[PDB]
Ligand binder design. Structure first.
Ligand SMILES: [Mg+2]
Ligand SMILES: [N+]
Length: 439
DNA sequence: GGGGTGTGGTAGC
DNA sequence: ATCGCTACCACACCCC
């Protein structure tokens, strides 16, 4: 065990945090896309009629953790047993579960304790450990396979296990469902072979949003082709409201109240007016949902096809540590902030940039919340606080940045013992050019 | 028209 | 035990 005041805490937490892995993996995939395309210009123009293939592993962590399980899980059966991937036993997140487990109602993000309560007596939950390096290896096979197929004009990384693949269709070619289904089965089989046993599902359509919905329809271990001209009540009746891209629990609640608790996209589709939509959830999100309910992408979503080099360019840099934060005095808080800045400046130097504005955010124990929350080392119920500084001259100097960060902390007046989480951000990044002569 | 701030929601497993 | 990250958009509200 390494406590938050140990010099090794950042390294050990990040080594264990699957959420840190997700964001870090997505950041390298973006960087890699940019480097592989420094001189290629493989982007989508208005001249292009395109097909979107949205590809995603099925229960990625659970699958890979199963396939690479240790000897003590040899007789474990991925098709018959309910499997979760998780660190602990009680208030530990279920990062991923297999479709057996989901058939009992278990869902990603549940705590293990919760999921156990849903099995019938005699059914035992299998808990596999994370296999992070293997998660990465299987992801590499994924993207390598996607490129080797030579069937896509643009391959966009969404995550470690997810990509949006664009195929341009010449006007002198008449695309058919049968060609599409066959591409889908090629991709599925090749990736199965290439990952030594992982399965992906695929949504295939003439919009991002439709391909996203098709993909959830395809799961598990299948594919679905639904083009705009195929839309139907049966399609929209298949989806819950937060199946819409951009609709999370909070948008959901607003939508449910405004619209009499729709229970499907078909329900919502028949009940809404764009203007009451905008009123309920906001103008831009409201227009995005309205567009989506026609199978259509909005302008914001289209940018990634039109100028992917720009969309995928990293614009800010930060760390968030809201677990294991237990400091007894301000000297230990200041040292942790210094370690944090050191870590960020390393990342910032890899990408050869400076920062001109930084932010510190913190979580503070709510006055009525227990000192030790239900989740071991959790942040629990907190109030958040944030404050930022413009630096003026962009910099990568530890002295300037760490000093300002610590000052930003003092500004927020959170007693060390009340502190439960910290975020350190470089919000505005500045390129470093060969000319550094300034007076 | 331009700018700024802090806060909040979402996405991946 | 247990590892509740991180980038980005949007918004509400403030200024000249
Ligand atoms: Mg959603
Ligand atoms: N999963």
């Amino acid at each position: 065990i390494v406590a938050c005041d140990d010099p090794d805490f950042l390294t050990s937490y990040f080594a264990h945090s699957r959420l840190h892995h997700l964001s870090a993996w997505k950041a390298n995939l973006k960087d890699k896309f940019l480097n592989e395309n420094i001189h290629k210009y493989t982007k989508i123009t208005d001249k292009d009629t395109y097909i979107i293939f949205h590809i995603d592993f099925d229960c990625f962590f659970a699958t890979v953790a199963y396939l690479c399980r240790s000897s003590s899980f040899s007789a474990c059966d991925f098709k018959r047993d309910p499997i979760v991937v998780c660190h602990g036993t009680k208030n530990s997140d279920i990062a991923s579960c297999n479709y057996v487990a989901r058939s009992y109602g278990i869902k990603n993000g549940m705590w293990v304790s919760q999921a156990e309560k849903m099995l019938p007596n005699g059914i035992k939950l299998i808990s596999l450990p994370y296999t992070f390096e293997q998660f990465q290896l299987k992801s590499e096979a994924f993207y390598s396979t996607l490129k080797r197929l030579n069937i896509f004009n643009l391959i966009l990384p969404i995550s470690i296990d997810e990509a949006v693949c664009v195929r341009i269709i010449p006007d002198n070619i008449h695309n058919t469902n049968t060609l599409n289904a066959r591409l889908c089965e090629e991709i599925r089989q090749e990736i199965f072979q290439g990952t030594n046993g992982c399965t992906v599902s695929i949504g295939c359509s003439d919009s991002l949003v439709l391909a996203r919905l098709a993909l959830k329809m395809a799961k598990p271990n299948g594919y679905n082709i639904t083009f705009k001209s195929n839309l139907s009540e049966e399609f929209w009746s298949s989806f819950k409201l937060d199946d819409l891209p951009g609709v999370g629990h909070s948008t959901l609640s607003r939508l449910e109240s405004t619209f009499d608790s729709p229970h499907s996209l078909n329900d919502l589709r028949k009940r809404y007016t764009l203007d009451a939509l905008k009123a309920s959830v906001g103008s831009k999100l409201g227009m995005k949902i309205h567009l989506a309910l026609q199978g259509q992408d909005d302008e914001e979503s289209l940018k990634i096809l039109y100028d992917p080099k720009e969309v995928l360019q990293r614009k800010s840099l930060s760390i968030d540590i809201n677990w294991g934060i237990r400091f007894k005095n301000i000297t230990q808080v200041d040292l942790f902030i210094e370690r944090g800045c050191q870590y960020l400046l390393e990342k910032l130097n890899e990408i050869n940039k400076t920062t001109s504005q930084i932010t510190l955010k913190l979580m503070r124990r709510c006055k009525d919340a227990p000192i030790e929350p239900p989740k071991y080392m959790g942040m629990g119920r907190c109030d958040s606080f944030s404050r930022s500084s413009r630096l003026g001259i962009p910099t990568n100097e530890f002295g300037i940045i760490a000093t300002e960060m610590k000052s930003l902390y003092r500004t927020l007046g959170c007693p060390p013992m009340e502190l439960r989480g910290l975020a350190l951000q470089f919000n505005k990044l500045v390129d470093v050019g060969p000319d550094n002569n300034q007076l």
